[PDB]
Design a binder for this molecule. Sequence first.
Ligand SMILES: CO[C@@H]1[C@@H](n2cc(-c3cc(F)c(F)c(F)c3)nn2)[C@@H](O)[C@@H](CO)O[C@H]1C(=O)N(c1cc(Cl)cc(Cl)c1)[C@H]1CC[C@@H]1O
Length: 137
Amino acid sequence: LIVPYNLPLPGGVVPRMLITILGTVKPNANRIALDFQRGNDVAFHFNPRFNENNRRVIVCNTKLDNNWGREERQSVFPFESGKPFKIQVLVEPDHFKVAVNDAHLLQYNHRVKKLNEISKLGISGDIDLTSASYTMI
Ligand SMILES: CO[C@@H]1[C@@H](n2cc(-c3cc(F)c(F)c(F)c3)nn2)[C@@H](O)[C@@H](CO)O[C@H]1C(=O)N(c1cc(Cl)cc(Cl)c1)[C@H]1CC[C@@H]1O
């Protein structure tokens, strides 16, 4: 698929919804972003950074009224330049749970409460996107 890519989430998200993003990281990747949006608000921004002060970090945040909130950062970094990945975002009642390549990575508590209005997933950055889909577990 072509990046950037928008995946509609009609009627938003619900607990037990498993969103699977498959792709390959580009060989000289700098950044990747998943943006779960409620209109212009970003309920959940998931942002692997490959070279922030010569380190790799996962930055997560929410954007409300076009303002970024308090970042939640994780140094566990499962992505590798040039390699195929699977990001799974499992919607739970109180958080998003992220697993990469079938290993738990992080949880992000719901700041945006209206899950049934989080109706788009934006996928951007330094990937070849293979597929973006969801199922109910
Ligand atoms: C560059 O801005 C990022 C935010 N971001 C990333 C992308 C993005 C990522 C992709 F992978 C991608 F492919 C793409 F197309 C677009 N779009 N927006 C977004 O990642 C946001 C997450 O908090 O961080 C922003 C940030 O870099 N800072 C920022 C942070 C806070 Cl809280 C407040 C403020 Cl005003 C700026 C830093 C300056 C000093 C701050 O530490």
